[PDB]
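Researcher: Going back to the complex we discussed earlier. I've cleaned up the inputs and rechecked each line, so this should be the final set. Can you rerun the prediction on the complete assembly and write out the structure?
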Amino acid sequence: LLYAFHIYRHNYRKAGSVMFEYGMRLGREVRTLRGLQKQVNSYLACLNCLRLIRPEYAWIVQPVSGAVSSQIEILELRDLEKEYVLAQTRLTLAKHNP
Amino acid sequence: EELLKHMYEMCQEMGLIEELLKLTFTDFEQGYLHKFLQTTGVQNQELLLVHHLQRANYISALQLNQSLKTNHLNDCDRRLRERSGARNAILDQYGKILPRVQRTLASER
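Model: Rerun complete. Updated structure for the full complex:
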């Protein structure tokens, strides 16, 4: 619902960040046979949205230190473009065998 | 329609329109309020602008302000010019925060 509402009308980066989060969390803690599945999903979605908010506006990073002094961090396209290129090869490899 | 008309007319006469805008509307009651505030003078179009901003309807708020910007090119009153200047500045700030697509949709007549 978060992602959902955030969209509703006229939302962008917000969506992106919510997506990232969901994803990372998922993995880090549950990940075993399907966390993989859904995290892959998450980030795929975020990537969609952020690719979209055209850098007419240019942006992303987050600011705090609570429930990982778990301070949030940035991007610049990069940061987790890395994260999902990565988790994609992770899936193709977990693919041919288990 | 008659009861909503009476409610909105009496709230306007008694100065209660700002408290009315805090209520939860159905799509029907909302459609009728939009029709009423559009017909009932320039001050009610500024209240409708505030309602669109409070409801996060930034596209309708920007389009309404462009309509108001086109209708006020001839006002002799200094107080209405200062108010329209402030209104324009606030909405031009909201317009800068919007995604490029929502800006395009707000700038497309």
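Model: Worth noting: Residues 78-97 of chain B form the longest helix (20 residues).
Researcher: Good, that matches what I expected from the previous run.
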